[PDB]
Amino acid sequence: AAAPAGAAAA
Amino acid sequence: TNTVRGRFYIVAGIISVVMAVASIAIFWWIFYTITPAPAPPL
Amino acid sequence: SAEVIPFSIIEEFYKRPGKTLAARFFGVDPFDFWIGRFYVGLFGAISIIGIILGVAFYLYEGVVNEGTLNILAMRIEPPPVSQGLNVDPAQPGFFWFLTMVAATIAFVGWLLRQIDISLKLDMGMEVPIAFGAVVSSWITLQWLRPIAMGAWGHGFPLGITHHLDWVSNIGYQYYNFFYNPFHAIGITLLFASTLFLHMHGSAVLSEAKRNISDQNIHVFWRNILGYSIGEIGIHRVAFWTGAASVLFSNLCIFLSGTFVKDWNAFWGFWDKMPIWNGVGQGALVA
Amino acid sequence: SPWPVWSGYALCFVPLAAVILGFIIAARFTDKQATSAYLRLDPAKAN
Amino acid sequence: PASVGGYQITCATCHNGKAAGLEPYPIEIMNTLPNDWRLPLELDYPGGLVVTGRKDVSNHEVEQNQFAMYHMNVSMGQGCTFCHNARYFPSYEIAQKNHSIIMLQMT
Amino acid sequence: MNWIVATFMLMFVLVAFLPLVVSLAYTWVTNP
Amino acid sequence: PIDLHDEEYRDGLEGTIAKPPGHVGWMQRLLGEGQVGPIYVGLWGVISFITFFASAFIILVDYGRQVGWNPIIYLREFWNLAVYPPPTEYGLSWNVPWDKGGAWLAATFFLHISVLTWWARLYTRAKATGVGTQLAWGFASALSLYFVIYLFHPLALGNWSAAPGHGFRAILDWTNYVSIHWGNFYYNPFHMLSIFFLLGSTLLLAMHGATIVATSKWKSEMEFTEMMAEGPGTQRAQLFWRWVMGWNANSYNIHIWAWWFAAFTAITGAIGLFLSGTLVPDWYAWGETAKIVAPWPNPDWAQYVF
Amino acid sequence: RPFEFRTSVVVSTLLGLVMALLIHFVVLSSGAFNWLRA
Amino acid sequence: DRPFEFRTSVVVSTLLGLVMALLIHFVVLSSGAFNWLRA
Amino acid sequence: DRPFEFRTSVVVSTLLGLVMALLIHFVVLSSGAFNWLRA
Amino acid sequence: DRPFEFRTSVVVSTLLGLVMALLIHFVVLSSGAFNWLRA
Amino acid sequence: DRPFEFRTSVVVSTLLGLVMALLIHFVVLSSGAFNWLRA
Amino acid sequence: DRPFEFRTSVVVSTLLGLVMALLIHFVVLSSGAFNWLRA
Amino acid sequence: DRPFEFRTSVVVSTLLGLVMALLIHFVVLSSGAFNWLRA
Amino acid sequence: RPFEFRTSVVVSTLLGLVMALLIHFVVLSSGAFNWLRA
Amino acid sequence: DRPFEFRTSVVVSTLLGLVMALLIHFVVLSSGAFNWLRA
Amino acid sequence: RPFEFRTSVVVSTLLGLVMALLIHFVVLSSGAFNWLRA
Amino acid sequence: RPFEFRTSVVVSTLLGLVMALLIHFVVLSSGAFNWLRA
Amino acid sequence: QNDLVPDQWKPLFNNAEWLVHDIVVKTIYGGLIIAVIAHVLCWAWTPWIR
Amino acid sequence: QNDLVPDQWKPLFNNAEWLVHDIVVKTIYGGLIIAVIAHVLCWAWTPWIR
Amino acid sequence: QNDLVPDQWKPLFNNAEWLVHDIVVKTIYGGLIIAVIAHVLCWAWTPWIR
Ligand code: BCL
Ligand code: BCL
Ligand code: BCL
Ligand code: BCL
Ligand code: BCL
Ligand code: BCL
Ligand code: BCL
Ligand code: HEC
Ligand code: HEC
Ligand SMILES: CCCCCCCCO[C@@H]1[C@@H](O)[C@H](O)[C@@H](CO)O[C@H]1O
Ligand SMILES: CCCCCCCCO[C@@H]1[C@@H](O)[C@H](O)[C@@H](CO)O[C@H]1O
Ligand SMILES: [Ca+2]
Ligand SMILES: [Mn+2]
């Protein structure tokens, strides 16, 4: 869920 | 060291350095040999 | 394929002993360890020695020997040009020399340390090359040019506002400095570097958190300029331009006290070429 | 007076302090973001 | 002052071994200048070529100043730093600037 | 001016160009 | 809903030319990409082209008039010809002769229009594809300094001759003259800030390029897919800069650093140049009152004399 | 369709405006007519 | 689909009118032919 | 969902107050209006 | 979820105190109002 | 196969001839040896 | 686990003390109030 | 778990001692207070 | 393909050409020999 | 496989010959030893 | 593993060599001895 | 396990070469021997 | 591990950290005593407040 | 491991680090004695406090 | 292809490289002879050491 850019995508 | 490649690299490096310094040396020897000294002022 | 890793596994996986330059020369690195986050080695001890000594000598020359607590009013100056290339502990410029030498060691040590780290992670040697360009800038300004001129008094003073008085006086002694061709090339490369940095930052930020493909940015950069460079070529161009900017500026400052004395006279040949000399009349001659 | 003029503080020292402090804060937040836990490829498999 | 040497103006000055045909402004010294620029001798010195900090002056006057200043340092065989400290051009800390004021008045 | 020391210093200034040239040549050779 | 093929291979005014595309080999070998074209032309790209070439036509015809319509003297003297703004005796007036400032005014107006329409083109083409409008605002920050140099500083000073001439040598001359007029520009503190940001931008560009090329065996330069899951190259770059400096960055926020370091240069430059003539008429004297000038009582001037 | 009407309209309108502005600038600089004089 | 767009023409007209107004005001007021804002 | 965070308000207020206080102190010090730290 | 951590408060307060002490000592020393460290 | 293309040689020869002709004409005109184009 | 580490405190204290000692020695030597290192 | 490593502490102490000795010797040599290594 | 031999011969040819040109100009501008005199 | 392509050798030799011919012509013309395009 | 003898040998040799060079340079530049003088 | 006599031989040879170069340069460029000008 | 520490300071100290803390505090006390003596001697030599 | 280290310093030192530490402390004592002698001799030569 | 090239320098030269190397050395020898003759003639014209 947690991603390098700071976005938490499903 | 054991292969021919390393020996060639070392010899090429030393040859290039000595050729550069000797070229500069002979250039300046010829220059100072043939070039006249400047005239002193009046 | 991809999961959440806490970056401790990442750091622990890549730590290995002994793949540096000292490990290849002596067979072992005497300082092959880490302190905190930093990696110490040979050339990490030498660099830190140089850093501490340079800071201490700079502050001793500024606070003592000048009696000022204002950091913007210090003139850490070299010896006069009448002293030649001689060093004397009983003469005013001595501490400047010490500071200069220490800085050189620090800078050179830093460079070599980078190579060591590049060898530990199995990388290329691009960062040492790009940094060695500006280390050569320092060496040209403080070592080669004063030796060719013949005195240590041709180097720059190390004050925060006073090293700019040297730049102003040197630039107006060889007037006009704008007419130096290598100077123009260096300024062109600096401006191009800043433009390229802004363009790359904008391009990567404009596609970050979006449900698009990787081909949208190519179509964008091809609709506007007619050419898109690619992802390996943007970063290659960045590296090359950044290095060349200072590489070309080394010549401009080296050739000023040697081989040249006036950059307005340098162009005196241009109007005297046989193709177009002797073709106008009045204020249109030459 | 041994003191600068008021525009010396307004034009020189406040921007200097602002630049230094902003650099420190931006570096702190950049490093905090970069060393956190998020999606990465496994170093053991990927190498 | 006596520190300049005490040399005198004679016939060979201003003539250099020629009777007529003297050229005050040869084509060899017009290298970066228009080939009709002449020294502005209708002004008063000091004050004729001062530009620093003036709001009744613009880049046209600064260009006219720079033409004369390059003529001067071609005529001395020197750079700008012979008469100036380049960190402040209004400064009078080099004696050659006063010598040059006297020589502008003479010419 | 010595003119012999100045030439060696000029050669050092020029040899400072070498790593970038080698980088360009490496890029050209390794990408046929 | 974006069809990239239609966005690149359409006809009309709202379409592209230079189709079918070309291919340059040495660009493919050195840079990795070799395709040139097609290039979009629209309404904002035809208004920029025509206005730019109107201004260029005016400048080049005036060059020819100054030379005397002689092609050989034109070639000889090309790099030191210029079109200059009206002298100081006129104010901001437009009732100036053509050979004493009218051509400069016309050409500058057309150049203003061209740069504005180019900004519009960047904005609209960013929205036509699916990307954000970050190049447009970077160009706006760059244009702030341009409009201070050519429009606002002359307006606040009260004459057009405070603006640069149109030529190869005239921009260097403008730089020299403007620094000489207002004291010394080295003691301008926003000049110091601008230099800080410019040299930092060059530092950062060299660093980023070198570190991405160094780790390119593991495809670290594909920064679009690295911002979703990081692989071995990005991990190695992070470890390199952590073991060198003590702190590192991401494959995302490094380009944030890049954008802001490049943007601050132009903004600080605009502020410094605008303040240069209107509030502080002498920067060395100001720096002397602000305690940032070193005394220097006994200079060794033998260095500066031949 | 080889020729588009919109391109013709845009190009002709822009050229007309550019020419009008240029002629006005030239005539103002000439000083022949009184116009905006002192 | 539509050969001409109304929104584009509106934007272009507004920008052109603003630019012309600014240019004419500056040209007219800097000539010195009118007695406007005189100390 | 709150429009603002309390932490941001606290940090902004503290920073603004500190900068304002330092500026006012140094502006008053160099004016010469008050005796204060006078040699 | 606390708004503030104690560690950041401690670090900020300590650095602010040290910087303020150094600044006030420098200003008081550079005024000439006290016979302190005069020769 | 073929080391050179005929098109490249033709282009190079044409460009070289044109440049040479222009250069020689300019040198002769500027020399002043022939009457030619005189006022 | 714990807000502060003992090692960081030791390191920071040592660095600060060393820097302060060197700075105070240089300032007191520069002041000229003591007959400390004179020819 | 010990807070420090012994080898690193030895290295740091040795480095500090060497730097201190060099600094003090170079400061004393050029002060002219002692008749040592005089030309 | 090895890069040593071609690089060596190219650098040798460049050095020889540059040295010959430099020595010829130095001898010409000295006036020791008659050579090209008015 | 070959150490040198024939095309590169031909191109280099042609360019060198042209440059040398131009250089010698200009040096000899500028020397003044021959009459050539006088007046 | 720690305090290996070879590393200590390397460190000692490097430090001794550097100190010898430094002291020779300092004594030569002091000008106190009549050594290598004109 | 990683120690060998070849390492010591190589290190000592390179060190001797560097020291010989440095001593030649220092002695030649001095008040005595005056760069062999005499 | 956390057994020689007093019960109050368990959440902050270990055994080794406790020993190193004790060493550091004794060193600090000795340094403070020496600093006081040095200042008293310097004042007896030349007072710096006049 | 630690068998000849004293009981008090077991969690801090090793079997070889104890020996290296003893060598270091003896080196420091000898250096301090030599430094004191050197300072006394230099003061007898020319006092630096006047 | 490694033929007609001696085994000592086989890891460096091919046969085409061998032919090019032979041409290069022959050119060098011819140039050296011509240079010696040129220097002798120039010395006979005007000696530069007196
Ligand atoms: C007129 C001025 C006088 C003079 C007046 C004074 C006065 C007054 C003082 C000194 C003090 C000192 N002087 Mg004195 N001194 C003079 C001239 C000299 C000269 C010289 C060549 O002229 C020298 C070499 C010295 C040397 C010294 C030092 C021995 C000492 C500074 C200790 C220190 O660095 O603390 C810093 C050391 C550190 C290791 C930094 C750490 C300290 C911090 C603050 C606390 C943390 C401790 C740490 C956590 C413990 C862990 C263990 C460590 C890792 C080892 N002085 C002249 C003659 N000097 C000071 C002193 O006596 O201190 C004992 C002092 O008060
Ligand atoms: C630094 C140079 C060399 C080296 C040079 C020497 C020399 C020389 C000697 C040794 C000796 C020894 N070395 Mg060793 N040794 C080195 C590296 C090592 C390393 C290592 C981990 O790398 C180790 C474990 C050792 C270990 C040892 C011991 C086997 C042995 C005995 C020490 C002792 O008795 O403690 C006691 C420890 C002390 C430190 C004594 C204190 C003296 C100090 C140094 C004072 C300064 C000297 C001063 C001029 C005289 C005294 C002052 C007065 C008090 C006023 N060496 C390095 C590579 N070593 C000694 C021996 O007996 O040889 C077999 C000996 O003489
Ligand atoms: C004697 C010379 C003076 C000096 C006088 C000045 C003056 C005057 C100025 C500067 C300014 C600057 N100086 Mg300075 N400067 C000096 C010495 C230095 C030194 C040095 C090492 O000595 C350095 C590094 C600098 C560096 C700088 C820069 C930081 C800064 C301008 C950068 C910039 O953003 O340009 C980039 C330029 C732009 C962004 C505007 C132009 C481009 C825009 C984007 C429009 C272009 C579109 C175009 C029309 C399209 C046509 C192209 C088509 C493709 C064909 N100066 C000394 C003191 N300097 C400027 C400044 O900012 O002041 C604070 C300025 O005005
Ligand atoms: C006479 C006064 C000058 C002189 C002035 C000129 C001028 C001026 C020129 C020459 C040119 C030449 N001169 Mg001459 N020349 C002089 C003395 C010399 C001396 C000497 C030892 O003194 C030598 C060796 C030469 C040698 C030469 C040749 C290199 C060259 C003629 C051959 C050639 O290649 O063009 C022959 C051309 C071809 C073989 C190609 C055919 C071109 C065709 C005819 C196309 C022409 C374009 C046409 C006009 C367009 C119309 C097309 C229709 C619309 C269809 N000159 C003296 C000093 N010389 C010319 C040159 O350099 O040309 C390259 C040249 O322009
Ligand atoms: C003009 C006289 C100068 C002087 C100028 C020089 C110069 C120049 C040199 C020395 C060197 C030496 N000098 Mg001295 N020297 C002077 C005054 C002194 C004083 C003094 C108190 O006055 C002292 C103590 C010394 C001491 C020394 C030694 C450090 C050294 C002794 C040579 C040696 O060890 O063999 C060295 C050789 C060996 C141990 C064996 C080497 C093996 C082979 C036989 C060497 C030939 C190699 C050769 C390059 C060929 C390479 C082979 C191929 C690559 C295959 N000199 C005076 C001021 N001195 C030399 C040096 O630094 O050497 C390290 C050196 O070059
Ligand atoms: C006398 C003239 C000067 C003066 C000139 C110097 C000089 C010069 C030095 C000192 C040093 C010292 N001075 Mg003093 N000093 C002065 C006045 C003072 C005053 C004062 C209040 O007046 C104070 C407090 C001091 C304090 C000090 C200490 C900081 C230090 C001595 C203690 C030490 O570190 O242990 C001594 C050292 C050790 C315990 C380390 C162990 C050393 C071992 C023996 C290694 C020696 C190297 C050896 C040759 C190599 C090994 C052998 C090989 C294998 C062959 N000085 C006056 C103003 N001072 C020294 C220093 O800074 O040392 C770090 C130093 O070099
Ligand atoms: C006589 C007046 C001057 C002098 C003037 C010159 C001039 C002028 C030159 C030399 C050159 C040389 N001189 Mg001398 N020289 C002088 C005194 C000396 C003294 C001395 C101790 O007195 C020495 C050691 C030398 C030594 C040298 C050598 C460095 C060199 C001869 C080697 C060479 O070129 O062959 C090496 C052989 C080759 C490199 C083979 C390559 C040659 C082939 C044949 C290609 C030739 C090009 C050809 C024109 C191309 C035509 C192509 C066809 C049309 C297809 N000179 C005196 C003081 N000297 C020459 C030089 O530096 O050349 C590099 C040179 O040009
Ligand atoms: C610089 C201020 C001069 C000094 C010093 C002397 N002369 Fe001169 N003189 C000067 C100029 C600019 C000219 C005009 C030259 C021209 O091209 O017309 C002259 C001219 C003369 C002449 C007349 C020349 C002629 O008619 O052909 C004479 C006879 C003459 N000058 C004499 C002269 C003497 C004797 C001087 C020393 C006492 C002397 N001049 C000094 C400028 C200057
Ligand atoms: C001695 C022959 C000089 C040379 C060489 C240069 N300058 Fe100079 N400068 C000189 C004088 C005698 C004066 C005073 C002019 C006056 O009418 O009073 C000046 C003046 C300037 C100024 C303006 C000073 C001011 O107060 O604003 C500037 C900006 C200036 N000069 C610049 C300058 C430059 C750029 C030079 C190198 C080309 C240069 N000067 C040389 C004397 C001499
Ligand atoms: C390199 C700088 C611009 C010059 C371009 C023309 C030089 C020759 O360019 C050739 C290309 O034509 C060829 O396609 C590639 C390999 O595909 O190799 C290059 O050397
Ligand atoms: C709309 C843009 C701003 C317009 C501001 C116009 C400023 C006019 O300023 C003019 C000067 O430029 C002119 O030289 C004199 C003539 O005496 O009169 C003034 O009013
Ligand atoms: Ca001219
Ligand atoms: Mn990137």
Residue numbers in the entry:
A (entry chain Z): 3 to 12
B (entry chain C): 13 to 54
C (entry chain L): 30 to 315
D (entry chain h): 12 to 58
E (entry chain C): 161 to 267
F (entry chain Y): 1 to 32
G (entry chain M): 335 to 640
H (entry chain A), O (entry chain 1), Q (entry chain T), R (entry chain V): 4 to 41
How does the study describe this entry?
To investigate the effect of Crts on assembly of the reaction center–light-harvesting (RC–LH) complex from the filamentous anoxygenic phototroph Roseiflexus (Rfl.) castenholzii, we generated carotenoidless (Crt-less) RC–LH complexes by growing cells in the presence of DPA. The overall structure of the DPA-induced Crt-less RC–LH complex was similar to the native complex (r.m.s.d. values of 0.866) except that it contained only five Crt molecules per complex and did not contain the TMx protein. The space occupied by group B Crts in the native complex was filled by lipids containing two fatty-acid chains in the Crt-less complex, and the total lipid content of the latter was much higher. In the Crt-less Rfl. castenholzii LH, five group A Crts were positioned near the second, fifth, seventh, 11th, and 14th αβ polypeptides. However, the absence in the Crt-less complex of all group B and most group A Crts had three major consequences. First, the pores in the LH complex that block quinone transport in the native LH were open. Second, the rigidity of the LH complex was compromised because of the missing structural contribution of Crts and the TMx protein, which is consistent with the result that a close interaction between Crts and LH1 proteins plays a key role in enhancing the thermal stability of Blastochloris tepida RC–LH1 complexes. And third, the Qy transitions of B880 and B805 molecules were affected, which could be seen as a blue shift of Qy absorption from 880 to 878 nm for B880 and from 805 to 800 nm for B805. In addition, since TMx was absent from the Crt-less LH, the Cyt-TM is slightly shifted. In the Crt-less LH complex where most Crts are absent, pores exist between adjacent LH subunits, and these likely allow for quinone exchange in a manner similar to that of the thermophilic purple bacterium Tch. tepidum.
pmcIn the process of photosynthesis, light energy is absorbed by light-harvesting (LH) complexes and transferred to the reaction center (RC), where charge separation initiates electron transport and subsequent formation of a proton motive force. Roseiflexus (Rfl.) castenholzii is a thermophilic filamentous anoxygenic phototroph (FAP) of the family Chloroflexaceae. The Rfl. castenholzii RC complex consists of three large subunits (RC-L, RC-M, and RC-Cyt) and locates to the center of the LH ring, and the relatively low r.m.s.d. value observed between the earlier structure and our higher resolution structure was 2.449 Å. The Rfl. castenholzii LH complex consists of 15 pairs of αβ heterodimers forming an open elliptical ring with a gap at the 16th position, which is occupied by the insertion of the N-terminal TM helix of the Cyt-subunit (Cyt-TM) and flanked by the TMx protein on the outside.
